[PDB]
Amino acid sequence: SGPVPSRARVYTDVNTHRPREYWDYESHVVEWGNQDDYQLVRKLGRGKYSEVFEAINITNNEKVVVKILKPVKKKKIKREIKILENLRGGPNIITLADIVKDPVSRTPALVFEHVNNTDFKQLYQTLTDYDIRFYMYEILKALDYCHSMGIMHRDVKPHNVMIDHEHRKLRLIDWGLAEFYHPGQEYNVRVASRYFKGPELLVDYQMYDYSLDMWSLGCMLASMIFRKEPFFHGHDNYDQLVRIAKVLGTEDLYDYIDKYNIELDPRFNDILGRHSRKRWERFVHSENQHLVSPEALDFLDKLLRYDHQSRLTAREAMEHPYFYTVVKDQA
Numbered sequence: 001s002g003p004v005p006s007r008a009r010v011y012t013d014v015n016t017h018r019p020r021e022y023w024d025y026e027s028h029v030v031e032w033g034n035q036d037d038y039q040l041v042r043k044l045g046r047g048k049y050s051e052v053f054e055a056i057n058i059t060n061n062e063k064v065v066v067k068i069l070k071p072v073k074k075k076k077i078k079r080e081i082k083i084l085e086n087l088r089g090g091p092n093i094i095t096l097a098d099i100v101k102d103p104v105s106r107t108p109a110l111v112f113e114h115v116n117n118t119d120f121k122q123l124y125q126t127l128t129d130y131d132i133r134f135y136m137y138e139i140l141k142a143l144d145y146c147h148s149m150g151i152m153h154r155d156v157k158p159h160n161v162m163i164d165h166e167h168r169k170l171r172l173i174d175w176g177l178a179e180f181y182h183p184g185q186e187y188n189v190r191v192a193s194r195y196f197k198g199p200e201l202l203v204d205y206q207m208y209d210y211s212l213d214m215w216s217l218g219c220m221l222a223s224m225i226f227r228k229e230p231f232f233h234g235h236d237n238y239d240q241l242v243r244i245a246k247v248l249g250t251e252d253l254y255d256y257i258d259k260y261n262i263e264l265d266p267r268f269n270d271i272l273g274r275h276s277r278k279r280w281e282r283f284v285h286s287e288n289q290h291l292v293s294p295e296a297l298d299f300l301d302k303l304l305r306y307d308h309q310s311r312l313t314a315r316e317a318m319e320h321p322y323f324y325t326v327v328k329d330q331a
């Protein structure tokens, strides 16, 4: 009978109501600067499809970041650029400063705003209960903004959240997997990073939406409040669902599969087994208790749901009691 269709509960038709130039990124004309305006200082890291460098803009001595793209479809480069241009100036969204090309190799590169980041592997262990609430609220500002702008990030994870802790400044980076939400579209499920993949990706339910990012956020929150990084530690995409099922239980998983008429891959039948929904208190211990509260657990419970439609939206999440003290302090 095929899967049951799904629509986002919020910002459903935002792209339909915009001119085609907004979302038809393949038609976007890119104007490439000369990479000679930037002098590379050092390599910061290598990605799946990019090499990132710290650089200096020789014209004004500003420190920037240059993301040299490895060859990918021109379609995909135009998508990242168009999304970054559409989101530019939005709350906690990384700023695309320039688009250049090396004169010799012709390799395209994206120039970004520099953030003085403290890596999550060093930062998260130092965060107070207030800090987690504060930064979660900052991520929510970025997500509600991009979702309102008709964009799903599709790769929310600690590496993609650059935090200048000294200045309490946060930027959501790496828009390379981001996509425009169009109601009825069947998207690629080979997105996000394993540990942050929502159950919709794991069961191959393609008609997903912005709510995908809310699952990923919930994975981040659970790792922060429980000091268990990553929270769901699967060995592969199949075992990832098993790890989730051992916490959220199998009853709701099978109800989700039923509701959407999802044809489940036959290997899941043997590996999923039967598991009760675990109480969040089972993850609380002497070393993380100070980060856990009834508000944190209620909020986490409302993000970590199989049914993507039942998760809090970024706007609903911002209104949660977990953030009452942050919201008070920001006024």
Ligand SMILES: O=C(O)c1ccc2c(c1)nc(Nc1cccc(Cl)c1)c1ccncc12
Pocket (backbone or CB within 6 Å): 044, 045, 046, 047, 051, 052, 065, 067, 094, 112, 113, 114, 115, 116, 117, 162, 173, 174, 175
């Ligand atoms: O991709 C983007 O959108 C993107 C955008 C901005 C930054 C970035 C990636 N990666 C950075 N650093 C980084 C750190 C570790 C490994 C790698 Cl590969 C990169 C970085 C640092 C400071 N300011 C901005 C950025």
